[PDB]
Ligand binder design. Structure first.
Ligand SMILES: [Mg+2]
Ligand SMILES: [Mg+2]
Ligand SMILES: [Mg+2]
Ligand SMILES: [Zn+2]
Lengths: 38, 349, 126, 141, 131
RNA sequence: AGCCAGGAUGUUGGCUUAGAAGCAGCCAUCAUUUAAAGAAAGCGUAAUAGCUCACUGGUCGAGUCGGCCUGCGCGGAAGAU
């Protein structure tokens, strides 16, 4: 999990979701890509 | 092939055994060993191929000499012609090999005194003539005169393209036996001169003051300064993390001045700690290369009464001294390079 | 295979005595190369190398730390043998039974050592 | 059809079996024997030439028995002796190393038309001069 | 993708072939292989040459648009992928039946021996070709 | 958008290096059958092998895809009685 002020899609499998008012990135391929904005 | 023949035969045997080693699938399991064998195989292969061809030509030469009732002359003549041609080809193909940078030549007198100076002058003249008949550049850096003759010690810097690869073997001690110029009688005298050849190297300084690897402590000063000095952090101490030098300052009232002065002193110390290390390394290398002039630890000998130059590393004697002293010492260098390269190929255990 | 050497090299005689006796006992064979006289103990498994130092310290008074000489598969052997012996000398050693053995480097580097000769090179002594 | 099971599709110049590192370890970890290629791989090449590089496949079944089939040499080495130069380019755009005319491209086509697909011999030559273009050969008129 | 322009080209080139052609078949080879397909076309073309218009453009309104002249009842091939194959020289040529040997040759899928219907044929094999 | 299938033929590319075979880097980047297929966008080997993607054929049945000008909101945002 990367906590940063600038979250982007890295691979083609990353997705942008909003969960309880917080933006975060999840992809099914590489668990190195999941991020949250903070 | 005086002596290199045995080494090349052993080299061929090594080529055969690595042929065997690269077909087992067990030495293939580990990859460092397989990589090393594959790397070393190529020079083994081509040199061994040439050596086997020369061996076959030689065993052809041996045959047909003990035969009569036929004009053996022309075919053996062409056989020895192609034999010599193949030998020259192998020499030129395996002698060479990198390091081709310019060189520093320092030659100084040893045993003998006022006559070792004269021989040092003669030896330097030889080397300078060799450099000149190569379109190289020679300039003198340091010189100490030898009273009666040439130089007690002369340090020059020879500049070209491939100087070191040829002049690296001229280091050690050189012995001369002759009737000197500083002699009232007709006695023959022995003396020696020490030669050091080193490569020229870059000395790129780095400002090892990276502000990311410093520990800076600020605290109160110690001494007489009244009320101001008590409630103020005006004293600095800087620690260099890798090197370990710690320098501190309380000279001035301002913190910034203390930091500047202490940082400058730290830089000076870290620079001196590098100069005073490379200097000792270079001094040790020059001491271990230079030998010690004692007319008993020498790499080659010159004899003017017999007009003979001999090399003790490879036991090579030639009666062309008068040619060598004029700067034709390329015939004293080629065998050394060839045999050293053969040795370097051998040292692959 | 491993190489054995002690901490006070002034106690070589006791090392030889202990090694020959413990070689009489079980299966710890001893080799001394034709050159540079450095002992090599060849056991059947690893724990022998432990118990040998354990006894050599407990009963005798030598320490004898180990080395890691590379070798595998020693093989025992008129003028027919003599000529090979003088030809290939750096790889021949004496046992503790004063026999002769050919210390190779690897089995692949041993076949070429027997492909060139009419020598039986049987190993298991008589 | 049998796909890649335990084999590799390569081999060195076929004139001699030469159990050298370029060919030895290539089948080293697959087992089999290396010298026995001589009676199976050098007799066939004794027809054509010695030392020319041609490709084969070393299809091996798990029985440790090797079955192999040859084919025409690659155009990379076939456009060397006909081109008259052993070596090749590597800066083809800036400078060229050799010359070649449309006279001899088709003459090597049938020697390679056994499996090289194409509509006709002439169209097969377009691919030949396409590979020749990047090899630094100059088209000669 | 093709815009509205070369869709005409996929028709204009194609329409001229059913006019001068003969008994033609189709094949639903959803899993063919290009090395197999290299032999399929080039063996059948080897007899005369590039006379195969064996293209694969069988959309319900991209191959049917070439039908309204001839093979009218063959227009019912609109469903899943197929492949036309025409012959100008040789009426009722092997092109229907040389797929049958291809069927045994790792092409079990061959659209169930239908072909076109000029003589109003059926789902059956016509292997006749007199010599 | 999903879902089935193909994703190839002469580069074991000279150049380079022990091997660089689509994929370390240096140069070009044509051509065959194509319905499409890069002289290769990514993964994976010592090198191969192997897995995806570019592109295309089929199913389903109609809306879908990014930008520009603008109003208000979200994150970025941690202190001591
Ligand atoms: Mg005061
Ligand atoms: Mg005693
Ligand atoms: Mg805000
Ligand atoms: Zn991702």
């Amino acid at each position: 999990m990367k906590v940063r002020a600038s979250v982007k899609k890295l691979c083609r499998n990353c997705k942008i979701v909003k969960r309880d008012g917080v933006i975060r990135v999840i992809c099914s391929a590489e668990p190195k890509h999941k991020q949250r904005q903070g | 092939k005086p002596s290199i023949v045995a080494k090349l035969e052993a080299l061929h045997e090594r080529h055969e055994e690595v042929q065997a080693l690269l077909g087992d699938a067990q030495t293939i399991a580990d990859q460092e060993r397989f990589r090393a064998l594959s790397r070393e195989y190529a020079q083994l292969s081509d040199v061994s191929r040439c050596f086997t061809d020369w061996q076959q030509v030689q065993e052809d030469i041996e045959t047909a000499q003990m035969m009569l009732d036929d004009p053996e002359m022309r075919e053996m003549a062409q056989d020895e012609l192609r034999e010599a041609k193949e030998k020259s080809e192998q020499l030129e193909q395996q002698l060479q090999v990198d390091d081709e940078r310019n060189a520093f030549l320092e030659v100084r007198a040893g045993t003998g005194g006022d006559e070792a100076a004269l021989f040092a002058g003669d030896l330097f003249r030889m080397y300078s003539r060799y450099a000149e008949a190569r379109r190289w550049r020679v300039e003198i850096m340091s010189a100490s005169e030898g009273e009666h003759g040439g130089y007690k010690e002369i340090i020059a810097k020879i500049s070209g393209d491939g100087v070191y690869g040829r002049l690296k073997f001229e280091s050690g001690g050189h012995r001369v036996q002759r009737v000197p110029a500083t002699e009232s009688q007709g006695r023959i005298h022995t003396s020696a001169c020490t030669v050091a050849v080193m490569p020229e190297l870059p000395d790129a300084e780095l400002p090892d003051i990276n502000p990311a690897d410093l520990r800076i402590d600020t605290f109160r000063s110690s001494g007489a300064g009244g009320q101001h000095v008590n409630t103020t952090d005006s004293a600095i101490r800087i620690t260099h993390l890798p090197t370990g030098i710690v320098v501190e300052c309380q000279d001035e009232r301002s913190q910034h001045k203390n930091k500047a002065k202490a940082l400058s002193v730290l830089g000076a110390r870290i620079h001196a700690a590098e100069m005073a290390k490379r200097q000792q390394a270079e001094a040790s290398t020059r001491r271990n290369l230079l030998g010690s002039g004692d007319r008993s630890d020498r790499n080659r000998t010159y004899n003017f009464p017999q007009g003979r130059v001999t090399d003790h590393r490879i036991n090579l004697t030639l009666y062309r001294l008068d040619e060598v002293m004029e700067g034709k010492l390329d015939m004293l260098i080629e065998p050394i390079i060839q045999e050293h390269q053969a040795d370097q190929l051998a040292a692959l255990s | 295979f491993r190489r054995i050497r002690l901490k006070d090299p002034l106690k070589q005689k006791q090392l030889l005595k202990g090694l020959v006796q413990l070689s009489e006992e079980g299966a710890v064979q001893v080799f001394r190369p034709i050159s540079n006289n450095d002992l090599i103990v060849g056991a059947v498994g690893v724990l022998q190398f432990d118990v040998v130092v354990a006894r050599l310290k407990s009963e005798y008074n030598v320490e004898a730390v180990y080395e890691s000489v590379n070798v595998a598969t020693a093989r025992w052997v008129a003028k027919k043998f003599e000529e090979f012996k003088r030809k290939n000398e750096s790889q021949l050693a004496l046992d503790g039974g004063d026999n002769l053995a050919y210390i190779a480097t690897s089995m692949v580097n041993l076949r070429l050592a027997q492909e060139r000769y009419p020598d039986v090179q049987f190993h298991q002594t008589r | 059809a049998k796909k890649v099971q335990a084999y590799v599709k390569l081999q060195v110049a076929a004139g001699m079996a030469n159990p050298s590192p370029p060919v030895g370890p290539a089948l080293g970890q697959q087992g089999v024997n290396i010298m026995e290629f001589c009676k199976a791989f050098n007799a066939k090449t004794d027809s054509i030439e010695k030392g020319l590089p041609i490709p084969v496949v070393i299809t091996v079944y798990a029985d440790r028995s090797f079955t192999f089939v040859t084919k025409t040499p690659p155009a990379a080495v076939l456009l060397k002796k006909a081109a008259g130069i052993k070596s090749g380019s590597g800066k083809p755009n800036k400078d060229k190393v050799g010359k070649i005319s449309r006279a001899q491209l088709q003459e090597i086509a049938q020697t390679k038309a056994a499996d090289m697909t194409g509509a006709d011999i002439e169209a097969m030559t377009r691919s030949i001069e396409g590979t020749a273009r990047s090899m630094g050969l100059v088209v000669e008129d | 993708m093709a815009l509205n322009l070369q869709d005409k080209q996929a028709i204009v080139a194609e329409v001229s072939e059913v006019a001068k052609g003969a008994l033609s078949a189709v094949v639903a080879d959803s899993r063919g292989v290009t090395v197999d397909k290299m032999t399929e076309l080039r063996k059948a073309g080897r007899e005369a040459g590039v006379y195969m218009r064996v293209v694969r453009n069988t959309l319900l309104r991209r191959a049917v648009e070439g039908t309204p002249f001839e093979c009218l009842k063959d227009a019912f091939v609109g469903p899943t992928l197929i492949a036309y194959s025409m012959e100008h020289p040789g009426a009722a040529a092997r092109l229907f039946k040389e797929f049958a040997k291809a069927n045994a040759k790792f092409e079990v899928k061959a659209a169930a021996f239908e072909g076109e219907l000029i003589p109003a044929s059926q789902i059956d094999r016509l292997a006749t070709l007199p010599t």
